[PDB]
Structures are given as C-alpha cells and as structure tokens.
Design a protein around this ligand. Structure first.
Ligand code: K16
Ligand code: MG
Ligand code: MG
Ligand code: MG
Ligand code: MG
Ligand code: MG
Ligand code: MG
Ligand code: MG
Ligand code: MG
Ligand code: MG
Ligand code: MG
Ligand code: MG
Ligand code: MG
Ligand code: MG
Ligand code: MG
Ligand code: MG
Ligand code: MG
Ligand code: MG
Ligand code: MG
Ligand code: MG
Ligand code: MG
Ligand code: MG
Ligand code: MG
Ligand code: MG
Ligand code: MG
Ligand code: MG
Ligand code: MG
Ligand code: MG
Ligand code: MG
Ligand code: MG
Ligand code: MG
Ligand code: MG
Ligand code: MG
Ligand code: MG
Ligand code: MG
Ligand code: MG
Ligand code: MG
Ligand code: MG
Ligand code: MG
Ligand code: MG
Ligand code: MG
Ligand code: MG
Ligand code: MG
Ligand code: MG
Ligand code: MG
Ligand code: MG
Ligand code: MG
Ligand code: MG
Ligand code: MG
Ligand code: MG
Ligand code: MG
Ligand code: MG
Ligand code: MG
Ligand code: MG
Ligand code: MG
Ligand code: MG
Ligand code: MG
Ligand code: MG
Ligand code: MG
Ligand code: MG
Ligand code: MG
Ligand code: MG
Ligand code: MG
Ligand code: MG
Ligand code: MG
Ligand code: MG
Ligand code: MG
Ligand code: MG
Ligand code: MG
Ligand code: MG
Ligand code: MG
Ligand code: MG
Ligand code: MG
Ligand code: MG
Ligand code: MG
Ligand code: MG
Ligand code: MG
Ligand code: MG
Ligand code: MG
Ligand code: MG
Ligand code: MG
Ligand code: MG
Ligand code: MG
Ligand code: MG
Ligand code: MG
Ligand code: MG
Ligand code: ZN
Lengths: 112, 249, 50, 86
RNA sequence: GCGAGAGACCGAUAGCGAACAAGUACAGUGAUGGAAAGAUGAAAAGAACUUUGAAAAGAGAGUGAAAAAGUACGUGAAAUUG
RNA sequence: AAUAGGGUGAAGCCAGAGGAAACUCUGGUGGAGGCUCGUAGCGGUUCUGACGUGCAAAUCGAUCGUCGAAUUUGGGUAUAGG
RNA sequence: UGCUGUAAAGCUGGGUCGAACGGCCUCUAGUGCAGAUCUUGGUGGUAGUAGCAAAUAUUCAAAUGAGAACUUUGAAGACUGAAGUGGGGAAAGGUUCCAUGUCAACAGCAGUUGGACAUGGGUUAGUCGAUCCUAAGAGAUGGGGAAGCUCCGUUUCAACGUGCUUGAUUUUUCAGGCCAACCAUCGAAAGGGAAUCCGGUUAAAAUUCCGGAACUUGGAUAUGGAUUCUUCACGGCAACGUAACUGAAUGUGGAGACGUCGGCGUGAGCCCUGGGAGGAGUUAUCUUUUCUUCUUAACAGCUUAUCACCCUGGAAUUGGUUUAUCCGGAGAUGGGGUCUUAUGGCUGGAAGAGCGCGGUAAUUUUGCCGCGUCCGGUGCGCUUACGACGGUCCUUGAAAAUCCACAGGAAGGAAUAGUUUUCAUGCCAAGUCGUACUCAUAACCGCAGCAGGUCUCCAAGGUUAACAGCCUCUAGUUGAUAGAAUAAUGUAGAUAAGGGAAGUCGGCAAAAUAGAUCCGUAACUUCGGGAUAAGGAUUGGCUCUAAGGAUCGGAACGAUCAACUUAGAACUGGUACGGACAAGGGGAAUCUGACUGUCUAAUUAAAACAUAGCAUUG
RNA sequence: UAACGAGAUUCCCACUGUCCCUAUCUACUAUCUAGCGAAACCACAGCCAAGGGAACGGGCUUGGCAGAAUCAGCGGGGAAAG
RNA sequence: AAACUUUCAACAACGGAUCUCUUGGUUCUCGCAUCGAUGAAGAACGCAGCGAAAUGCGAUACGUAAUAUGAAUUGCAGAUAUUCGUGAAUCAUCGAAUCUUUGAACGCACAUUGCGCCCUCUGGUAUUCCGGAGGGCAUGCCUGUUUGAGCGUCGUUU
C-alpha cells in the first residue's frame, strides 16, 4: 500500500498538523492537511448550541453573509429562543409586580 | 555544612505556588458606599472548582453603581449557595446564607465565613472548606465584636468588618484517606513543591541537623528555641510541650 | 538545517568563499612565499562553530 | 552512561553569535555575552586576564579613524587645502 | 600612545606567545587556552630535448662556480638503517 | 507528543428463584484498578558471560525489572559554587 | 694521518664545505651534563608482531581500464520484511546535493569507485514556515536601594494618549464628540493563527517553476439586484428561512479555548472479493487460471445527521429505549416539522488530465494516431477522523492576539427620486528572510566513515490474540579486507549411556514447564485474594453434521443474500499433532520491607529512600 | 500480618554434563598466505645448583655444563606490566 | 662453510644538530601630548581584469580629490593610458571627500536583515491604500522659547 508524508516542515502529530489520506487524479495516495474543526456558537445564558447559525472558525465569520450568523429574533445570534422567551416573560411579570408594589405602597402610605 | 531545605524555600525558585489553573483570588467586594450605607444585589453565575483549593468558588455578578458596567466577583462559596441565587451585601443586607454583612449587624451565635480581620481587607478568616467563624458578642460602645476562629482562638474585630453568612462549602474532605502516594502527588501537583518529604534523620550531617550517625537518630532535643537561627530551626520550634496529648487542653 | 537565519546563511556564504585553493598565478610573483592556502576547511573535519 | 552515551545528547546551543563582538558567546537564555558583556554599555574586561585584553584592544582591528590622528596632529590639525606652488 | 637614538643583550628549542597570511591554525558550550613554522642559487639560469614506463618516476642530456645546491633545496652531527 | 495484544472482572443495571418481614440466593450485563501476563518503550538483575592496549573512557549478548501511570519523552523556562 | 699534555684538552694529515675566524695580555658572564618518572624534537627493539573475526552471502559473464574480489551493466542467489536496511521531517551540520574530470593524500585490503580531490551548476512562494499572539518566564520606564559595577520592582506613593472618531476646511486654519481600569518590550519553525490544489517539468528546485483551476487580506469602485411614498425587506403558529434587507458612543456574550480512559456508531484510506474490457506469466498434465490497469485534487452549487429544538396531544394495564437504564404532567409514546453540515451522494472542476493497451514517425528537438478507462459486493478486519454516550479525580485538565453576533438607539436618511460595497459581478496589489542535501551501522554528538547516543509521521499479504516471532510483495540494500586449511586453547552454540546436585560458598550455568479447551484446585486471608495454586485430560489431517443472521413479500411461512465462531461424529496415520515460531517450573517455611514507586550515570537496586496511615510542634 | 519482592535463608518434587567422567559436533578465531599494520614495555641482559651477600642472584664465588637459525603453544620465573 | 648476530670504515639513508647569518625580539636613553554623539575602540559582511590569506579600502569599496614628484607597473593581460607633460606609478604627502551593516549606538526591536510614525518629492484613477527617493523621531542634564497646571498665592468685581 502507498505511504504518505507530511507536506510541511512540522513532523509532529499536533493539533494543527492533522492529515487526511486522499487519492489524487494521478492515482496517488497523498496527505491532505486538515484544518482544526470549528466549534458551534453557543447561548450566553444557558450555553446551548444556537440553531440556524453556521459553525465556523472565528476569522471565517467576517467573510460570510449576515443571514448565516444570526436568527431573525431579539438577541438572535446571541441567545437561544427559550432564553429569550424567559427574559421576556420575566421582564413583563417583574415590572407588573413593581407597579403592584408601588400602588400598594401608596395604599399603605395613606392609612397607617 | 550545607544550606538546608528549610532555608532553600525562601528564595522561591522551585518553591513558588503553581498558579496557572487558579481561577482568581477569592475576595469580598471593595467596601464602598452601597455596602457602608445600604445593600447591593448580585446574582450567582457560577460555582466552580479552584485547583489547589478544597472550597469551591462562586462567580457573582454585580452592577457598577457609577458606570454602565458589570462587575464579576470571586467569592468563596458557602454551602447551600446555588447558581442564580441573589446575594445581598451591605449594612442593610438581611441575614441569609451567602449574604455579606458587617459583623455588628449579625446577632450572637451567627455563623459567618470569609471574615475580615480589618475593615476592607476583603476577607481573612475562615476561608477553607468546612470552616467558619462564630460571633460571640458585641461591644457597641467601643464598636467591637468578639468572634471564635476555626482554631479555637477568640478575636476582637471592628464591628464594621464584613463576613459572609454560612459555612464554607466542601467540608468533610479530610474524612477520606488519600490511600496512595499518587493521590498526594496529584494533590500537591497544583499546590506547590513540598511533597514528598525526606526525613532529615535520613540525611547526612551536611544536609540537616538530624543527619548522620551509625543509627538514624536525632541525637539532641528536637525542641528548638524560638530564638534559634535559620539552619537550626528544624524540629519542634518553641514547643511548650511534647508527647501524646492526654486530657483536655 | 533548512530553516536557517539570514545571519547564519551569510556566515555560510563567506565560509564557502574562503574555502578555495590558491590561485596559481600568485606563486609566480617576485618574493612570493605562499605555496598553498593554509586555511582550508573540510565540513566533516573542522566545524565552523556558528 | 555519563560519557559517550551522554555526549550524544548535544544539539541545543547555549551560546550564539554576539552582535557586538561576533564571537558566539551570547548566552541565549541570559541574553548576555560572556566575552564582551553585551548588552552592557561597557566592554567586559578584567585585570586578571591580560591576554584577553591583548586579544581585543586598539590595534587588533582597523583603527580606521585613530590611524590618522597622529598625522593630523603633526600638521597642527590643518583646515583648508594645499596651495599649488607657482 | 607617537616619534627617534642606542647597547660588553638574544641569535630561530634563544629573544616577546608571535623574525613567517600570530593572538594565526586549532580546542572548549563558555570564561578562556593557544602552537608549530626562517636559510637553493649572484641570477630560475626551476632541467629544453631523446628514451623506458599506464603514471609517478628512472636513464641519458642540459643550466650552473657547484646538482657532494633540484624547491622532499646552505652546511647536513647523533640515535637508527641499507 | 508517545504507550500491540490478552487475563481478571469492582460499582451501577436487567431477569429469575426463595422469604411474613428485616432481607437472601442464582444467571447475565457492565468494564473499575498507582491490578495482572506480555510487546514498543523506560530500566539495568544475573551470568560475577563477552570485551577488558574494547566497537565503546561503560559497550555487546543472553537473562531479567516494569510496561496506563508517583508513566516515558522533545522543546521552552527557572534555580549557580559554601 | 698522527703529535703534545697525568688530565681537562691543544695542534695537525686526508675528505666534505662555503664566509668568516683565531693566538696572546686583560675584562665579563644566561660559561662545561649521563641521569632530575627532567624539557622539546627525533629514532629504535618489540615487529612484518598483536591484529584487520558482531550485524546470514555471495557467484558467473560482459563492459571499462595499464591494472578489476571491491567500478558499471546483465543474469542469478539472498536479506531488511511496513515498530524496514522503505518514504519524509525537527535539532545539528553547511554544499556533503548535481554534472564533468579525476586518484598524490584519505576511504586501517584495493580502487578505474567515493560524503575524497578539481572545475562548474544548483535552492523561484500573497496561500508552506518565520514574521504576529501570549505561556512559564525575561525585562526597560517612574521610583526606591547601593561607594559603585548595578539591585528591586512591572504599574508599582507617576501630571504616563508620538490618543481615536466624525463633519471638514481648502479658511492647509479647524469645530468638536468620546474615552485613557489594563496596556514598553521580548518570550513557541510542536501551543494560538487569514488564504492552493491537481497534472506536468530538472542532471540537481518545487504545495515555490509551467498549464489549468481556486482562495484570503487590504484598497479602489461602477453596474445589476435588493430597499424606500407605511422610509431603514418579507415569510413561518413555532423551532426558524432567505441573495440582499441603516445602526454611533457604550455594554453583554460567543468563537479562539483545551484532561484522560471505556465500549459503541458513522465515514475515509487500506485490506478482501464478483462481472467485464486490456496486458503479462504457467501450460507433460491441471488451472473460465496466477499477477497486473480500470483513477479523480483544492474549490462551487444542490442535497445529506446523530444531537438539540418547535407544533400537536395528554400518558398506570406505565410506556419509549441503549452493548452499556436513562427519559417522560418541568409533557413520554404517537403524528408533523426546524437546525448545525461533521460525513456521504450528484453535478461543475474533468478527461481535455493521469493510467492501460494497440498501430505507427525518426540520426531525429520530441511525437502522432486509435481503443478502453465500466458496473458491483463484503466486514467483531486494520489505521485514522468524527459523533452520541458512559467512567474517573482531596487531580476538574493555559493565555493572549484576533473574528463575529447581540443589546442600545446617536446620526443620517425618499418620490421624481433617495441608500449599500455583510447580495452578485467587475478592477488593483500582496513586501522581507528561509527553501539544495543528510537526518544517521558514513553528512549530527561521541578526537573517526566509532556495534554507543539523538525527537517524530505514514505502514501490504500469510500464520496468529497479536503492530510479537517466522516467510513473502512494493521499495532499498547485497555494505563490513580477502584466499587456503580446519591442530591445541578459546568465543557463540548443540548433543550425550546409567546415576541425578554426590559438584559448588551457594543448583551459578543449563535443563525442565510453557499456547488453547475442558476438568480440578489447599493452608491462610485485610474476604478483595491466594490462583495459571497444586494436579490431570485433549489438540493433526480429511469427510460430514448442527447451532448462532440481514433485507424484502399480508409471516410458526417463502424469496434472495451473507461473517466466521462454537459444538458433535465418522474415517485416517510408525500414538503423531500449541509438530517451526512463540511460550509460567512448582511446593513447605524462616528473616525482612506493607504494597505500586525511587537512588549511588561508570563496582552496592537493597532490608536503604519515598509512601498512604499515625502523632507531635509553631 | 493477607498480598506483593531481579531482597537474605532452609527443605521437597521436577529437571538436568554442576558432578562421577568425560566424549563428539557446528560456526568464528587462533593457524598459513597477499595487502595493511600498532602498543605496553626496555640499566645491560637473559640456563641451572649451592654459597656468601641489603639475610630469596641473570651477573659475584664454586661447581653442573655449554653448538647456528628457529615455529606453534604455555603460563614456573623475570620478587613481569599497570 | 654460509646465513645470522656484533663491531668498525666507506658510500647511501633517516633526521635536522652544528657553523654562519637576521627587515625580529629585549633593555636603556632622548623628544612629544593627539580617541569618541562632528559617532571612537571593536565587530560583521563585502570590494581587484584574473585573489584564498595578510595588507588596504567601503557600493566613489587593494580606493576618489588635492599637494608634491617626475616615467613607471610587472605574475600574466590591457587600454576609448601616458612621455620637452595639467603627466606613468606613488598609504610620497595629505588640509577635500566617500565611509555598507553595526558598535557608547540613539524611532521600537533584534536567536528576526521584524515593526512603526512624521515631513517633502514621486509612481499607481489617492490627505486616508500600495510602491519608491530623500530628510527626521533615544535618554539624563543646562540655558533660553512657547504652551500650561495647582484656592501655593497677590491685586480687582459681584
Ligand atoms: C552465516 C550466519 C550464521 C552461520 N552459523 C553457522 C552454524 C552456527 C551454529 C551454531 O550453533 C549450532 C551457532 O551458535 C550461535 C552459530 C552458527 C553460525 C552463526 C551465524 C550468524 C550469527 N553470527 C553471530 C551473531 C549473529 C547475530 C545476528 O543478528 C544474526 O542475524 C543474521 C546472525 C548471527
Ligand atoms: Mg503552530
Ligand atoms: Mg440563520
Ligand atoms: Mg510525610
Ligand atoms: Mg518522609
Ligand atoms: Mg545515608
Ligand atoms: Mg550541623
Ligand atoms: Mg543541634
Ligand atoms: Mg543524627
Ligand atoms: Mg546509615
Ligand atoms: Mg530508624
Ligand atoms: Mg545515644
Ligand atoms: Mg480530666
Ligand atoms: Mg540552556
Ligand atoms: Mg620562539
Ligand atoms: Mg614559542
Ligand atoms: Mg635549512
Ligand atoms: Mg659546493
Ligand atoms: Mg650546497
Ligand atoms: Mg642539503
Ligand atoms: Mg650513524
Ligand atoms: Mg501495574
Ligand atoms: Mg506487571
Ligand atoms: Mg546489558
Ligand atoms: Mg564480568
Ligand atoms: Mg583479551
Ligand atoms: Mg525536557
Ligand atoms: Mg655564501
Ligand atoms: Mg682578538
Ligand atoms: Mg645555565
Ligand atoms: Mg643528554
Ligand atoms: Mg651526574
Ligand atoms: Mg627521560
Ligand atoms: Mg619524549
Ligand atoms: Mg598474524
Ligand atoms: Mg578481534
Ligand atoms: Mg526474510
Ligand atoms: Mg515485525
Ligand atoms: Mg528518515
Ligand atoms: Mg554525490
Ligand atoms: Mg586502504
Ligand atoms: Mg592505494
Ligand atoms: Mg570537496
Ligand atoms: Mg501560513
Ligand atoms: Mg507573566
Ligand atoms: Mg529589572
Ligand atoms: Mg530609573
Ligand atoms: Mg513576539
Ligand atoms: Mg508559531
Ligand atoms: Mg492549547
Ligand atoms: Mg504537483
Ligand atoms: Mg528534491
Ligand atoms: Mg502557476
Ligand atoms: Mg473513544
Ligand atoms: Mg471502511
Ligand atoms: Mg484547502
Ligand atoms: Mg466530473
Ligand atoms: Mg469527561
Ligand atoms: Mg527539500
Ligand atoms: Mg552512530
Ligand atoms: Mg562529528
Ligand atoms: Mg559479518
Ligand atoms: Mg547423561
Ligand atoms: Mg538418558
Ligand atoms: Mg530422580
Ligand atoms: Mg548441591
Ligand atoms: Mg553438597
Ligand atoms: Mg563437597
Ligand atoms: Mg556449605
Ligand atoms: Mg538461573
Ligand atoms: Mg496449572
Ligand atoms: Mg519495597
Ligand atoms: Mg553503580
Ligand atoms: Mg561516586
Ligand atoms: Mg548493579
Ligand atoms: Mg518493585
Ligand atoms: Mg632490574
Ligand atoms: Mg639459582
Ligand atoms: Mg641465604
Ligand atoms: Mg634480576
Ligand atoms: Mg662460573
Ligand atoms: Mg597465555
Ligand atoms: Mg610468569
Ligand atoms: Mg644556529
Ligand atoms: Mg635593538
Ligand atoms: Mg523571535
Ligand atoms: Zn560579545
């Protein structure tokens, strides 16, 4: 079987020196240098992988269109759907209770 | 003779602490206006392992009172503190586990941790896992508080000094045997170079005051004066007594 | 090695240029005393120390 | 194995060429020349090594400027040009 | 250091380490250590040419006052050797 | 950055059998351990083998210890002569 | 050649030689050698002696040459045997690379050969590295010590911006608006990191050259599209979708960015295999046979997934479900969807390339022509990548540069027209240094062409548990002074009647055992072990039998396809059979250290050190 | 004190050239040749017996004796070398 | 008797003593006072018609200018080189210059031929991007200039 060599001066099996074995149109088995695998964009609240967002190595986000990097919603490419939903419900309920506690305070600032 | 292993540690070449993996210094907030006059509220974001520490640390996010910003603090996690818990710090903070209060605002018998020796030093006393400080009493006329430290010592601290209500998490760690040299190796691998220890009696007279002899033996009293000099203080330094502790102390 | 600095490669260029035999027309000059280049260097024998 | 076997593990230079004196005495990790003392402002020299002073002193190089100070002094440090005789 | 004049000095294992492409060659990671090595002849006139030999060389010849001066060069001791 | 192939078979889990209960027995599954046999590796026990003006200023051969961690190792870096 | 003197010595004949030198009266001293394991140089005996013996191995012929054991070519015989004697690299070397010539020295024989000697030639980058970032750390500044060389310190008791962003102004002046926690700098050719592939080409260079085909960053910039009269787009219940589809200061997040092990799953390459189309080999006989070609890069488009998420619905007779038991009223099963594109498929790249054949051109630079290059299958296979999981820790397994998104709502925006280079297309540019070769039983270090040492990647067939050992394919070597004999003594290795440790300090050395299946297994025990305890049986070849699955068809059944495991039987043979290879001897006790681990490199590996555990001290 | 041990020791089974008691065989040496070619060491050297003697002589004294040139082995002596 | 061994002589070797030289050394005396930010000493790398070293020099590179002198240089070659002359050779002299990369070494950095910024000019459809040429940007301290800071502080006005 044909055997392959590294294509660069690095002779060590490091994280940035990973290779694949590929057959060329010349009928040859050569090494193809493989880039490090990209990690998924994650939610800033819960840490889960965001849907609808491309998995790219950080510099590659600069060279891709905006629809790949975001989702059409508030906090689109930053927070997930459930964490945005919980933020909205929490904000509404808490501000409602702030109004309730204010009118109640004015109710106890006129009878006691 | 030779410079002994006691004395080689002060130069701190290979005897500095291994601190690459440490998650920051555990401190209270800087004592500011909000803590001196009212309270400020933060939220627990993380409870994490600090290598070299038995106690977990809590990452707590506070708002900056003066600029639009978030301030992340590294507290020592008290047991029962959870992620998403609201932490209140200040003079007017309530007596709940995890809240940071001045010592004078805590009644007698209050269990408190990461207590300040001096007002604003951000925590000195009772910081290891399972340890705490008991508030013994108050002297409001002199603005002083009497506390009991984990060693059993009674201390008088300013009543303005702060502490965190509860017991430091991670207690009971010493209850389990290490069982292995490798376990101690991994324990000190992220602490410092103090393990393993060769017995001085097993060395030569150059290496140690206990070295030498046709049998391994100390040869002179291993209780050493407090006024002895470096290179002599090997053994039981300024020992008031020796031998098995019998009866109460 | 293949990966070398410019300063190294410049020293190796001078070391190659100094390792030549004597030009023969020099022995014909009047009052000439040099019979051969006495500062030859073989790669395996004497190292450059660079 | 402290002789021949240990001598086979020598491939990490402690010293490289110095920029001031070009001698291969520049300690890489110390960033200092053991010969001329670079990068210190002064040149490294000792009275207990007189032969070392001999090896590197005035006259062992070109003296591209001190060559001519004596000849300029003998003429009183002339300014101008020589005048052609009639 | 620069420029001079000298000596009851040494005479190439001496005199400076160095009379010479000497602080050179070379060693050492490094600080440093550090040699050996002058002389054909007045002049290369450094042996054209022939011959044997694969060649180096040899044998004739030639130059020279001398080749009992041929660069493996003045003289050419001893050990050692034919 | 590196470390064949086997053995043993810890928790946890599934099923069956027995029991009034407190609980017990059996068959699987699972894949623990500074566990074990044993390569590479790392080491260096014995022959008191070879060699001992050596291949070698420490090697060679067989035999042997250990071989998933207190493991082995490159490079970078720190510690310097009482 | 002699003479003189007791002598230290003086004189003289002959030969050689070529430029200075002596007697006498005095002066002066670095003034007399057999020794100092004296110093430097030179030379012997030893002595044509010790020796030139590891790494299986060479042989015939031709060519060349004065000369061939050693050079070249051919033929053969071998070996390394993919953890290589193969193909590359890091450190280190530095021209050893290639061609031509060449043999004085060197290659411990030789030499026509060479890593030698001589003369030339040779290393091509926007995409590979360096360069940049920060790591452990190193280290200026402000300061503070120190007689001082210098020491401390790394933002520190400092008034620390050669600040940016705009509207500009052409008034080459400005107007301001924001900030200044941190932030000198150096520190990785294995960490982090913008972007390139295939085919061809040289004597020697190639991810660098040639041909073709791409990509990134920075800049410039127009057209098309998109958007606006509801000014800064629509659709979907939703997960979210798209060719686009404003967004300042400031803020919040994400990526960069992360241990190790275990089994499982998927892919790729390799291994195996059927048909067909070619070529070669065997052919007394047999063999629809044995070997070999049948390939497809980066890049672009469409499609493709475990996990995760959304909508519906409302669950005990609890159901779903993994090799591994986890999930569900905090919403399971069921039904329908969304997403990441890891990975595969199709197409473009691209057959025009490469490969395999056949037929022709020619001193001939170099070719020209024709045909084919197709369709499958298989898996506890090997390696490797990824995935979803599970275990583990008093151990929880870098940082920074850099890139993006989001929050916020400053500012600016249309109708006869307005905005934007995160949509498509188009234009320009990408500097500097390295790049040859060796990487080792001859290119490095050990004084050397030294059996030592020196980091790492790829990895075929058979046997087998096996990447072991043994044999072989590709590739590479056939190098190590040779010839003739075969005494003693050796060194390495074998065998041995009968006895069986009587040898010896001592079973040192050697022998014996050894794989697998089945049976059987004691004391003691910290209950985990001891244990492969001990101790037995079997094992080949051949011919059979049985069991163990997948996908389809509406079935306890049919069709098709498929892997090697296990068990049983008959027969068979000089009773052999883990047939080479590979591969524990065992037991009863005492001393001692609990164990795994560690040290005297180069005479001691141990009972020594360490260790968990225990205790004391501050 | 279970387990573990290249630790020290005793006994038993198996096993055997450890031994009785040796023999045979293979390769590489040694050996002989062509080529190549060191070193240690060296006062001078090299036959014994007795004597005396610095009390253990190659040399001296007295005897025995004594014939070129040598090869392979060998380890008594050279109070051999280091 | 040869051979062999030993001694001697002759011739030839080996080796380099002896003799004789000497642009070197050593020591004594006399006279003189001159390195560097106007960039030294030192280092690296280059430079010749044909050069490796030593010597000299710096991209103007075994040297340019100038003064003096007056026909060479030389191992070979060769002038668009020279001879009653602005003329060969010349570290003869020397007063004008050139003086790479560095080095106290100075934009920052340096195990890198790494990275800036400012001014003028210039090329590419460019105040901003890319290229090129030239000139600049170190620190401590002194005098002065300008711009500032401080309820340190003087005068005046609500
Ligand atoms: C031609 C090769 C054989 C010849 N024969 C003849 C008979 C025989 C008989 C033996 O005993 C019956 C014996 O005992 C050992 C050796 C021999 C020798 C050994 C030699 C090879 C051997 N030479 C020495 C060491 C060695 C090392 C290796 O790596 C290695 O691999 C190729 C091989 C070797
Ligand atoms: Mg890298
Ligand atoms: Mg999207
Ligand atoms: Mg201890
Ligand atoms: Mg201890
Ligand atoms: Mg000791
Ligand atoms: Mg003492
Ligand atoms: Mg004492
Ligand atoms: Mg003692
Ligand atoms: Mg002792
Ligand atoms: Mg003791
Ligand atoms: Mg006592
Ligand atoms: Mg009592
Ligand atoms: Mg170092
Ligand atoms: Mg001399
Ligand atoms: Mg001398
Ligand atoms: Mg002479
Ligand atoms: Mg004569
Ligand atoms: Mg003569
Ligand atoms: Mg002579
Ligand atoms: Mg003689
Ligand atoms: Mg183990
Ligand atoms: Mg083991
Ligand atoms: Mg060994
Ligand atoms: Mg031995
Ligand atoms: Mg021997
Ligand atoms: Mg290391
Ligand atoms: Mg004369
Ligand atoms: Mg006279
Ligand atoms: Mg004398
Ligand atoms: Mg003498
Ligand atoms: Mg004497
Ligand atoms: Mg002597
Ligand atoms: Mg001598
Ligand atoms: Mg011999
Ligand atoms: Mg031998
Ligand atoms: Mg083989
Ligand atoms: Mg193998
Ligand atoms: Mg290699
Ligand atoms: Mg070659
Ligand atoms: Mg030879
Ligand atoms: Mg020869
Ligand atoms: Mg050469
Ligand atoms: Mg790159
Ligand atoms: Mg740091
Ligand atoms: Mg400092
Ligand atoms: Mg300072
Ligand atoms: Mg850097
Ligand atoms: Mg890097
Ligand atoms: Mg990392
Ligand atoms: Mg290519
Ligand atoms: Mg190549
Ligand atoms: Mg191209
Ligand atoms: Mg796995
Ligand atoms: Mg596959
Ligand atoms: Mg690519
Ligand atoms: Mg296609
Ligand atoms: Mg995990
Ligand atoms: Mg290459
Ligand atoms: Mg080697
Ligand atoms: Mg070498
Ligand atoms: Mg051999
Ligand atoms: Mg027998
Ligand atoms: Mg028998
Ligand atoms: Mg018996
Ligand atoms: Mg016995
Ligand atoms: Mg006995
Ligand atoms: Mg006996
Ligand atoms: Mg006995
Ligand atoms: Mg044994
Ligand atoms: Mg058994
Ligand atoms: Mg032990
Ligand atoms: Mg030892
Ligand atoms: Mg020692
Ligand atoms: Mg030992
Ligand atoms: Mg052990
Ligand atoms: Mg004697
Ligand atoms: Mg006698
Ligand atoms: Mg006697
Ligand atoms: Mg004697
Ligand atoms: Mg006699
Ligand atoms: Mg002998
Ligand atoms: Mg003897
Ligand atoms: Mg003389
Ligand atoms: Mg003189
Ligand atoms: Mg660097
Ligand atoms: Zn220097």
């Amino acid at each position: 079987a044909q055997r392959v060599t590294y294509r660069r001066r690095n002779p060590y099996n490091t994280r940035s020196n990973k290779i694949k074995v590929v057959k060329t149109p010349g009928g040859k088995l050569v090494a193809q240098h493989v880039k490090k695998a990209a990690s998924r964009v994650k939610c800033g609240d819960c840490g889960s992988a965001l849907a609808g967002i491309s998995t790219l190595r950080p510099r590659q986000y600069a060279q891709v269109s905006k629809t790949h990097k975001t989702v059409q919603r508030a906090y689109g490419g930053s927070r997930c759907a459930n964490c945005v939903k919980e933020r909205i419900v929490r904000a509404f309920l808490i501000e409602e209770q702030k109004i309730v506690k204010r009118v109640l305070k004015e109710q106890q600032d006129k009878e006691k | 003779g030779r410079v002994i292993r006691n004395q080689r540690k002060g130069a701190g070449s290979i005897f500095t602490s291994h601190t690459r993996l440490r998650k920051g210094a555990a401190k209270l907030r800087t004592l500011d206006y909000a803590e001196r006059h009212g309270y400020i509220r933060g939220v627990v974001k993380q409870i994490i392992h600090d290598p070299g520490r038995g106690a977990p640390l809590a990452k707590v996010a506070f708002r900056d009172p003066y600029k639009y910003k978030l301030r992340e603090e590294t507290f020592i996690a008290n047991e029962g503190v959870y992620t998403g818990q609201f932490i209140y710090a200040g003079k007017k903070a309530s007596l709940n586990v995890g809240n940071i209060l001045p010592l004078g605002a805590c009644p007698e018998g209050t269990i408190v941790s990461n207590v300040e020796e001096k007002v604003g030093d951000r925590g000195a006393l009772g910081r290891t896992s399972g340890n705490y400080v008991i508030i013994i009493g108050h002297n409001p006329d002199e603005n002083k508080t009497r506390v009991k430290l984990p060693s059993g010592a009674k201390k008088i601290i300013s009543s303005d000094a702060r502490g965190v209500i509860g017991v430091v998490a991670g207690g009971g760690r010493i209850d389990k045997p290490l069982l292995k040299a490798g376990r101690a190796f991994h324990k000190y691998k992220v602490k410092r170079n103090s393990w393993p220890k060769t017995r001085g009696v097993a060395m030569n007279p150059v290496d140690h005051p206990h070295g030498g002899g046709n049998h391994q033996h100390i040869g002179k009293a291993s209780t050493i004066s407090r006024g002895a000099v470096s290179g002599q203080k090997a053994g039981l330094i300024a020992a008031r007594r020796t031998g098995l502790l019998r009866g109460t102390q | 090695p293949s990966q070398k600095s410019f300063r190294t490669k410049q020293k190796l260029a001078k070391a190659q240029k100094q390792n030549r035999p004597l030009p023969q027309w020099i022995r014909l000059r009047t009052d000439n005393k040099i019979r051969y280049n006495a500062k030859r260097r073989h790669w395996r024998r004497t190292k450059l120390g660079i | 194995g402290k002789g021949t076997p240990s001598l086979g593990k020598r491939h990490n230079k402690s010293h490289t060429l110095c920029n001031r004196c070009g001698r291969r005495s520049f300690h890489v990790q110390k960033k200092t020349c053991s010969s001329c003392g670079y990068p210190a402002a002064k040149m490294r020299s000792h009275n207990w090594a007189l032969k070392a002073k001999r090896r590197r002193t005035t006259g062992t190089g070109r003296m591209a400027y001190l060559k001519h100070v004596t000849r300029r002094f003998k003429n009183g440090f002339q300014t101008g040009v020589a005048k052609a005789q009639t």
